[PDB]
Amino acid sequence: VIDFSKPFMSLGISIMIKKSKPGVFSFLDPLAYEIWMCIVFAYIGV
Amino acid sequence: SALSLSNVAGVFYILVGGLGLAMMVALIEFCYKSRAESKR
């Protein structure tokens, strides 16, 4: 019913998310879980 | 973020190799002393 021009602005559907408090056991964070488990295994073996 | 096991796998290998070496040394000494007793 009307004549449009070429798009002066291109868009689409996108996701707005929001934009952490430390966990209780976050002192284990620097090392991976596998490292801790293998440390326990190595301690037992040693 | 966390440090992965691949970053420190070599020290685990070294530890297990050292445990095996200690076992081998102790067993060799035990066998030598057992032979020594059997001779005497």
- Cβ contact, residue pair B15, A31, below 8 Å: no
- Torsion, Cα of A25, A28, A29, A35 (10° steps): -140
Reported resolution in A?
2.9
List the 6-35 stretch of B: residues with Cβ below 8 A of A: 8, 12, 15-16, 19
- Torsion, Cα of A20, A26, A28, A29 (10° steps): 10
Alpha-carbon distance of B15 to A37, in angstroms, equals 15
User: What are φ and ψ of residue B3, in 5° steps?
Assistant: -70, 130
Whether residue A36 contacts residue B7, with contact meaning beta carbons closer than 8 Å, is answered with no
